[PDB]
């Protein structure tokens, strides 16, 4: 036994070192597992008291001021812009001040802000994050795709195929995916969505929105999209406001932003220039020049 005491000590120390390194890995794992989401919560009885799905979609901005760190500065400050139910109000004011903040405030990306909001006549801060985003649609600013069923790419939960998706395809101009792609709806995305279009992002967003039965529609700017894609997207926004009876958008290019039913200017967290008729927007040269 004295003969073997030697390598016993050696390997004990060595395997201790390896155990130490791998336990540091466990320590970092628990560092991740010590992050708790504050926003996710439930405070009301949802069995019968809330409506099954919001229909009116009322909107009001009760001076909502959003601060993530709650110490440095806010992004919105005492904003009160009334979006007319059935009439879009998308304003490209200070780009990094109002549009990102509003989209984040509706959809729980900013669920902690001084002041509140009434969503369809009901305060939004008394509902779960997933419920708050359950009956509402939005698009992105940049494209992202990956391998997976197109049917679940549009409607993972509801999964209403061919009745809506083909109709959702109809508004889209994706003629190739029906035949040029291997299977189409039953086939998954190929090569991580690097072979279809830059309009595939907008088409998928529109397909999800129409398959969400959008009580409210939210849009965003463009990164690099085909002109035909822009025309189809804007026309289908009009048609979605025609049928689903709601639309709302946002943009950053001056002329494209002017291609809207209503618009205003919101700068430095507050309101800069608001006119209910769109004619006054053309009347104001300086405000129009502000964007570009």
């Amino acid at each position: 036994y004295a003969l073997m005491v030697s390598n016993y000590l050696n390997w004990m120390v060595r395997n201790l070192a390896d155990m130490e390194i791998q336990l540091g890995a466990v320590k970092r794992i628990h560092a991740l597992l010590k992050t708790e989401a504050e926003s996710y919560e439930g405070l009301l009885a949802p069995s019968l008291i809330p409506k099954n799905w919001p229909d009116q979609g009322k909107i009001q901005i009760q001076n909502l001021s959003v601060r993530y760190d709650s110490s440095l500065k806010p992004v919105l400050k005492h904003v009160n812009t009334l979006i007319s139910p059935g009439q879009k109000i998308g304003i490209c004011g200070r780009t990094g001040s109002g549009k990102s903040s509003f989209s984040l405030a509706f959809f729980r990306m900013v669920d902690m802000f001084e002041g509140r909001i009434i969503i369809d006549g009901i305060d939004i801060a008394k509902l779960p994050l997933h419920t708050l985003r359950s009956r509402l649609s939005i698009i992105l600013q940049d494209p992202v795709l990956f391998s997976g069923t197109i049917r679940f790419n549009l409607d993972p939960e509801k999964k209403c195929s061919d009745s809506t998706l083909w109709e959702a395809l109809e508004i889209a101009q994706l003629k190739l995916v029906v035949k040029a792609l291997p299977g189409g709806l039953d086939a998954i995305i190929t090569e991580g969505g690097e072979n279809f279009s830059q309009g595939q992002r907008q088409l998928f967003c529109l397909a999800r929105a129409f398959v969400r039965k959008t009580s409210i529609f939210i849009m965003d700017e463009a990164t690099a999209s085909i002109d035909m894609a822009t025309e189809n997207i804007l026309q289908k926004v009009v048609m979605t406001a025609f049928a689903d009876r709601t639309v709302v958008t946002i943009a950053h290019r001056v002329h494209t932003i002017l291609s809207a039913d209503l618009v205003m200017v919101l700068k430095r967290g507050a309101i800069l220039e608001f006119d209910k008729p769109e004619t006054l927007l053309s009347q104001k040269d300086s405000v129009f020049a502000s964007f570009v």
Partner: protein, 50 residues
């Protein structure tokens, strides 16, 4: 026991990172999470047992 640790820790980490705020991710280095999710999970699932 190593197998049990692997399964339960992985599913718990998935669940928690799902129910997480995306403001943190915009603050997170976006590769630190990927590291401690691939390399560290591999270590505890393939080396801590042995």
């Amino acid at each position: 026991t190593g197998l049990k640790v692997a399964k339960r820790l992985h599913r718990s980490l998935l669940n928690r990172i799902i129910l997480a705020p995306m403001r943190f991710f915009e603050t997170t280095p976006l590769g630190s999470i990927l590291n401690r999710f691939s390399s560290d999970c591999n270590t505890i699932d393939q080396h801590i047992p042995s």
